[PDB]
Amino acid sequence: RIDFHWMLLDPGDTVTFTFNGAFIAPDRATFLRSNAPSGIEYNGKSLGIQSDAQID
Amino acid sequence: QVQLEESGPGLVKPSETLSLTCSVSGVSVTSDIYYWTWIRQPPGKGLEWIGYIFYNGDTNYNPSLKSRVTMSIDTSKNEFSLRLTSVTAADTAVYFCARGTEDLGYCSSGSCPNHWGQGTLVTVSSASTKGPSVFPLAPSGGTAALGCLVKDYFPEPVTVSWNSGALTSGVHTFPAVLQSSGLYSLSSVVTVPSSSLGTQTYICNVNHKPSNTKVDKRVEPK
Amino acid sequence: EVQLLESGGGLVQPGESLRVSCAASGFTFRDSALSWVRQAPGKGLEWVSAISGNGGATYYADTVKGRFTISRDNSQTTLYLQMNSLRADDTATYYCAKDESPPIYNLMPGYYSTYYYMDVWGKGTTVTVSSASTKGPSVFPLAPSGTAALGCLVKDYFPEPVTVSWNSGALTSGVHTFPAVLQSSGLYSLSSVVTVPSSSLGTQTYICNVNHKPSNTKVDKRVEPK
Amino acid sequence: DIVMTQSPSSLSASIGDRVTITCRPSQNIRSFLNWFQHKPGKAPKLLIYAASNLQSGVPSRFSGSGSGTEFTLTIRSLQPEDFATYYCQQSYNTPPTFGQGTKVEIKRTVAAPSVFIFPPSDEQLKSGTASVVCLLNNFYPREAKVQWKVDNALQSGNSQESVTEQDSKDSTYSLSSTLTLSKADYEKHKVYACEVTHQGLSSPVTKSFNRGE
């Protein structure tokens, strides 16, 4: 099994990773789009639903 | 305390990308409290704020333009820049760069640009560049008038000096007129002593950066 | 096609009666409501009245609460409006308008749903209420004295409207015919002007053609530099 | 998205007079309102910040007042250098928005234009075009009519005018009119004249030259 643990990192904060093994390492950081500065990545405030229906 | 000089093409074709740069003198673009802004004014229309950028990365763009505009700060060159994609004739405007100082006691964040550049005109058009032809206006109760005619250039502007920035009092450089040919023309004139026509030198300098043209005309009796 | 046509109207002395017809043609089965709306040139819209089914309306505005009465003739598919005791302010362009309601209302198909919005408007019939007495216009030149302006003043006529053309309609560019104004005499005055090249005055004849159909009067007036 | 309604769009006033420009935002903005001045060809300048604070170098004849939904810029004794377009600007929410501007023009005494006529240079005639320029220098008020005459036939359609903005020291205007002809038509005629009609001239003034003299 592989178990994933996550955190939210404030700006200017270091996450320090220390390990002798068994460790699965992040290659990329995930940034929300509704925290963007309107620098055109920015696409604000989604609603996530659970649906069995098609799209239209 | 700061000087702000704008630069960029002057002519961009429709659907292409508009890029402008602002050269900053007197302060560093790496300062924590200043923000850098662009504003524009279409010919004969109102001022429209485009956005601000802080060195720390915080930006805000007008929603009318946000899906097409970005800004950046170049710390190495002490510059900041505007990038506007997929332009149309609605984007022909004078573009002003400006500095403001974060001051949340009296102003929303990034919302009070208080040192502006003089603006640079950008024309969105498919027409090609054309340098001016420059012709003299030769002199005929004490005062004589002379000048230079700057005809058939595109797009705007031309700049005119008389004697490289030396003769300055009495100069009138007229707003350009659009001719039926689609090219611009203007005149620059100066008043001088008639007693001066026999012995002293006058050269108008007509400079047009989009066509990389410098033309000197010297003026005198027919 | 749901268009209706308004017939009738005209000039009437204050205190008289006049009924306006509204031929309801097209999609309207005439189990739906209909309304009248008047507007005077220089003023906005104003709802007048409404009709429903048979005698369910009985819906009149406070301005005409005791004067106007609304009839409906479903056999010939025509809506009426008997305008009695007409006053001066009743001069307006009376529009016959369709009436539609949200499908949640209007339980019985015939009766009135007390929430209607008008969707299909009519061409409108103009009704003028004065003590006037039809009169054709006098036409005077506005003489030109690179670009020159010349024109015609069409003065002292009643009622509206007049039509003005230039050179029998061969001259269109640069023509402006202004809205008439009402003088204290109760007669109208309007101007029509045209801008033309100064160089054309001497070679080219300009004539304004004025038509006032209410008095079947027809004037051509040549406008010359003087 | 806050709409700034400035009024009037334009005004004219004499030197020494008190001038007032109003700004009404579309919602209450407390004191988050700035006033800018824009003189021809110069950088827009912040004059007043946060409704009433005079910026460095701004003369004390300028004052800002108001809050909420009505603001006033007053210029208490107008000087020629105050010719400019003035704008209000809200800093209350993003995006910052500007009023449509108020153009302030100076009324001064009538000044007749000085008139000059320039024949086309020989260098241009090799291009197949002849430009004839008439200069009307330093006049007030703005109307001046320029009629071109070539061998006394009035011209129309073959000239264009350009007028400077009001001068920041003497509050006058200047105007150029350029008559354009093909060289072929230019040499078929002789007398070239610019005729100027203006409130400062008791009757019209004509400057002329003779082609080839």
Side-chain angles (χ1 to χ4, degrees), chain C residues 133-156:
Chain C
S133 346
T134 296
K135 182 182 181 303
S138 291
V139 179
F140 303 114
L142 297 170
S145 291
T147 285
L150 55 88
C152 283
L153 178 68
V154 180
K155 182 154 181 177
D156 285 353

Short mmCIF file of all heavy atoms in Angstrom, two decimals, chain C residues 133-156:
data_model
loop_
_atom_site.label_atom_id
_atom_site.label_comp_id
_atom_site.label_asym_id
_atom_site.label_seq_id
_atom_site.Cartn_x
_atom_site.Cartn_y
_atom_site.Cartn_z
N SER C 133 -58.75 73.46 -37.05
CA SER C 133 -59.57 73.42 -38.23
C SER C 133 -58.62 73.35 -39.39
O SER C 133 -57.89 74.29 -39.69
CB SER C 133 -60.42 74.68 -38.29
OG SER C 133 -60.38 75.33 -37.03
N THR C 134 -58.60 72.20 -40.02
CA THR C 134 -57.49 71.83 -40.88
C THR C 134 -57.03 73.03 -41.71
O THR C 134 -57.87 73.81 -42.20
CB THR C 134 -57.96 70.68 -41.81
OG1 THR C 134 -58.26 69.53 -41.01
CG2 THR C 134 -56.89 70.31 -42.85
N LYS C 135 -55.72 73.16 -41.86
CA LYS C 135 -55.12 74.25 -42.62
C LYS C 135 -53.81 73.82 -43.26
O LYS C 135 -52.95 73.25 -42.60
CB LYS C 135 -54.85 75.44 -41.69
CG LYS C 135 -54.26 76.67 -42.39
CD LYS C 135 -53.99 77.79 -41.39
CE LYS C 135 -53.43 79.03 -42.05
NZ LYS C 135 -52.19 78.75 -42.81
N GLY C 136 -53.67 74.10 -44.56
CA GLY C 136 -52.44 73.80 -45.28
C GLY C 136 -51.32 74.79 -45.00
O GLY C 136 -51.56 75.93 -44.62
N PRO C 137 -50.07 74.36 -45.22
CA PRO C 137 -48.92 75.21 -44.87
C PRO C 137 -48.59 76.28 -45.91
O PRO C 137 -48.94 76.17 -47.09
CB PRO C 137 -47.75 74.22 -44.81
CG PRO C 137 -48.13 73.15 -45.81
CD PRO C 137 -49.65 73.06 -45.78
N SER C 138 -47.92 77.33 -45.43
CA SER C 138 -47.18 78.25 -46.28
C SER C 138 -45.74 77.76 -46.30
O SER C 138 -45.23 77.27 -45.30
CB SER C 138 -47.25 79.66 -45.70
OG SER C 138 -48.57 80.16 -45.80
N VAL C 139 -45.09 77.86 -47.45
CA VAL C 139 -43.73 77.36 -47.57
C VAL C 139 -42.83 78.50 -47.97
O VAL C 139 -43.07 79.16 -48.97
CB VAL C 139 -43.67 76.21 -48.57
CG1 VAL C 139 -42.27 75.70 -48.71
CG2 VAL C 139 -44.61 75.08 -48.11
N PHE C 140 -41.82 78.76 -47.15
CA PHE C 140 -40.92 79.88 -47.40
C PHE C 140 -39.49 79.39 -47.56
O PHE C 140 -39.07 78.43 -46.94
CB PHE C 140 -40.96 80.86 -46.23
CG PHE C 140 -42.33 81.39 -45.94
CD1 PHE C 140 -42.96 81.07 -44.75
CD2 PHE C 140 -42.98 82.20 -46.84
CE1 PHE C 140 -44.23 81.56 -44.48
CE2 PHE C 140 -44.24 82.69 -46.58
CZ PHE C 140 -44.86 82.36 -45.39
N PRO C 141 -38.73 80.08 -48.42
CA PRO C 141 -37.37 79.61 -48.62
C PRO C 141 -36.44 80.03 -47.49
O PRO C 141 -36.60 81.12 -46.94
CB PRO C 141 -36.96 80.28 -49.92
CG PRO C 141 -37.80 81.58 -49.95
CD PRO C 141 -39.07 81.27 -49.22
N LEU C 142 -35.49 79.16 -47.17
CA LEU C 142 -34.34 79.49 -46.33
C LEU C 142 -33.14 79.56 -47.29
O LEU C 142 -32.54 78.54 -47.62
CB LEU C 142 -34.12 78.44 -45.26
CG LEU C 142 -35.25 78.26 -44.24
CD1 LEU C 142 -35.00 77.03 -43.41
CD2 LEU C 142 -35.37 79.49 -43.35
N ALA C 143 -32.84 80.76 -47.75
CA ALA C 143 -31.95 80.91 -48.89
C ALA C 143 -30.50 80.86 -48.47
O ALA C 143 -30.13 81.42 -47.44
CB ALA C 143 -32.25 82.19 -49.60
N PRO C 144 -29.67 80.18 -49.27
CA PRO C 144 -28.23 80.12 -48.99
C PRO C 144 -27.61 81.46 -49.25
O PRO C 144 -27.94 82.12 -50.25
CB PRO C 144 -27.73 79.09 -49.99
CG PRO C 144 -28.63 79.30 -51.17
CD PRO C 144 -29.99 79.57 -50.58
N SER C 145 -26.70 81.89 -48.39
CA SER C 145 -26.07 83.19 -48.57
C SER C 145 -24.56 83.07 -48.49
O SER C 145 -23.95 82.35 -49.28
CB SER C 145 -26.60 84.19 -47.55
OG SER C 145 -27.95 84.52 -47.82
N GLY C 146 -16.87 76.19 -48.77
CA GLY C 146 -17.06 75.04 -49.64
C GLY C 146 -18.46 74.46 -49.54
O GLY C 146 -18.99 73.92 -50.51
N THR C 147 -19.07 74.59 -48.36
CA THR C 147 -20.39 74.01 -48.09
C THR C 147 -21.43 75.07 -47.72
O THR C 147 -21.19 75.93 -46.87
CB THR C 147 -20.33 72.96 -46.97
OG1 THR C 147 -19.72 71.75 -47.47
CG2 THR C 147 -21.73 72.63 -46.43
N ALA C 148 -22.59 74.99 -48.36
CA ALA C 148 -23.68 75.91 -48.07
C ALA C 148 -24.91 75.17 -47.54
O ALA C 148 -25.15 74.01 -47.87
CB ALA C 148 -24.06 76.68 -49.32
N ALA C 149 -25.70 75.86 -46.73
CA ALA C 149 -26.95 75.29 -46.26
C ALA C 149 -28.11 76.06 -46.86
O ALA C 149 -28.04 77.28 -47.03
CB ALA C 149 -27.02 75.35 -44.75
N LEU C 150 -29.16 75.35 -47.23
CA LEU C 150 -30.38 75.99 -47.71
C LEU C 150 -31.54 75.16 -47.19
O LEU C 150 -31.34 74.06 -46.70
CB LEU C 150 -30.39 76.08 -49.23
CG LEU C 150 -30.20 74.78 -50.00
CD1 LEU C 150 -31.52 74.08 -50.25
CD2 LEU C 150 -29.49 75.09 -51.32
N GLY C 151 -32.76 75.67 -47.28
CA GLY C 151 -33.88 74.94 -46.73
C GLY C 151 -35.22 75.57 -47.04
O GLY C 151 -35.32 76.50 -47.85
N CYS C 152 -36.26 75.03 -46.40
CA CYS C 152 -37.62 75.51 -46.57
C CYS C 152 -38.22 75.54 -45.18
O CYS C 152 -38.00 74.63 -44.39
CB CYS C 152 -38.44 74.58 -47.45
SG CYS C 152 -38.07 74.77 -49.19
N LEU C 153 -38.96 76.59 -44.88
CA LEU C 153 -39.74 76.66 -43.67
C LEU C 153 -41.20 76.38 -44.05
O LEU C 153 -41.75 77.02 -44.93
CB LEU C 153 -39.55 78.06 -43.07
CG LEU C 153 -40.31 78.38 -41.80
CD1 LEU C 153 -39.78 77.57 -40.63
CD2 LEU C 153 -40.20 79.86 -41.55
N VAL C 154 -41.77 75.39 -43.40
CA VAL C 154 -43.14 74.98 -43.64
C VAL C 154 -43.96 75.41 -42.45
O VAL C 154 -43.86 74.81 -41.37
CB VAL C 154 -43.19 73.47 -43.81
CG1 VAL C 154 -44.61 72.99 -44.07
CG2 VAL C 154 -42.24 73.06 -44.91
N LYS C 155 -44.75 76.46 -42.63
CA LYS C 155 -45.31 77.15 -41.49
C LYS C 155 -46.83 77.21 -41.52
O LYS C 155 -47.45 77.26 -42.59
CB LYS C 155 -44.72 78.57 -41.38
CG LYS C 155 -45.24 79.35 -40.18
CD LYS C 155 -44.29 80.43 -39.70
CE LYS C 155 -44.90 81.13 -38.49
NZ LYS C 155 -44.02 82.17 -37.88
N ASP C 156 -47.40 77.18 -40.32
CA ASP C 156 -48.80 77.46 -40.10
C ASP C 156 -49.73 76.44 -40.72
O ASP C 156 -50.67 76.79 -41.42
CB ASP C 156 -49.12 78.85 -40.62
CG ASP C 156 -48.61 79.94 -39.70
OD1 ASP C 156 -48.13 79.62 -38.59
OD2 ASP C 156 -48.73 81.13 -40.06
#
